Amino acid sequence: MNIEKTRFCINRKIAPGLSIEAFFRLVKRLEFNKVELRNDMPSGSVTDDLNYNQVRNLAEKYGLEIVTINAVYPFNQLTEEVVKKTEGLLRDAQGVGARALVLCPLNDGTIVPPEVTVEAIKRLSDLFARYDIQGLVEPLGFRVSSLRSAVWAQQLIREAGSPFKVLLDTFHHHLYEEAEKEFASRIDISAIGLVHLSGVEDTRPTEALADEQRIMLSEKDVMQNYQQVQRLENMGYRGIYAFEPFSSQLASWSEAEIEEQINRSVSL
Numbered sequence: 178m179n180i181e182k183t184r185f186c187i188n189r190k191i192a193p194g195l196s197i198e199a200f201f202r203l204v205k206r207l208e209f210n211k212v213e214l215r216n217d218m219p220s221g222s223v224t225d226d227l228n229y230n231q232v233r234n235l236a237e238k239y240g241l242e243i244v245t246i247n248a249v250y251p252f253n254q255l256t257e258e259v260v261k262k263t264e265g266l267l268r269d270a271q272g273v274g275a276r277a278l279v280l281c282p283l284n285d286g287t288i289v290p291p292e293v294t295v296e297a298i299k300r301l302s303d304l305f306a307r308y309d310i311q312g313l314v315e316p317l318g319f320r321v322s323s324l325r326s327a328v329w330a331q332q333l334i335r336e337a338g339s340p341f342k343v344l345l346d347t348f349h350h351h352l353y354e355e356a357e358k359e360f361a362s363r364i365d366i367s368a369i370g371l372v373h374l375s376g377v378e379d380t381r382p383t384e385a386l387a388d389e390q391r392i393m394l395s396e397k398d399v400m401q402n403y404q405q406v407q408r409l410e411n412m413g414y415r416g417i418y419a420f421e422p423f424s425s426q427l428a429s430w431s432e433a434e435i436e437e438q439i440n441r442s443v444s445l
């Protein structure tokens with residue numbers, strides 16, 4: 178297996194400690210060219226205390242692409258409150274020159290009918306076009322997720338007639354029983370426009386693991402990061418990979434610890 182390095186993205190959630198400057202100067206210095214900004218770090222702001230300029234220039238200086246902002250939730254349950262909140266994020270992404278905003282389904286045990294997610298996808302595609310932002314729909318694995326399958330979400334994006342793509346997240350994939358030898362032919366790598374990697378070394382049962390159980394990559398993470406990435410490659414994927422580990426263990430890691438466990442990960 179070989180994959181081109183320039184194809185690697187560093188999701189900020191990996192670095193809750195660092196300021197954006199701090200976070201940027203890192204990456205670049207750590208090699209690569211793509212990041213993800215997020216609206217769920219301590220600041221609660223895609224820019225922390227900054228403004229669009231400061232950030233934008235900070236991406237220029239370190240020659241980085243802001244690939245996505247995570248995330249809009251619940252994109253699916255698209256009340257006027259949610260619409261106003263989404264608009265926020267589009268202003269953010271347009272503001273920092275992000276290319277995508279990440280869309281997360283309702284994740285609370287409530288059914289969101291396919292017809293409604295299909296409407297929410299129509300309405301968000303208008304609203305995105307309005308800010309010239311791309312969309313990425315991230316199915317969530319959990320039994321309580323109102324959209325679990327990357328296949329189904331492609332089905333529903335095709336139906337809304339949307340240029341949006343799916344965000345394949347290794348954990349959420351892992352966490353969803355009916356894919357792998359039901360995936361493969363059913364899935365369409367054309368329309369996967371981002372892949373979020375994170376590893377789960379933990380011996381617990383899959384059937385109720387969480388965002389907290391996500392460290393980085395290395396031999397015996399019970400998630401098939403290689404075997405997913407092997408297949409994604411086998412299949413045509415020439416798009417981005419991003420490290421989006423969550424877990425409280427991203428709490429150690431000097432600016433130099435993060436530097437290395439990114440490299441454990443990139444096993445090749």
Ligand SMILES: [Zn+2]
Nearest residue numbers: 315346373421
């Ligand atoms: Zn993700």
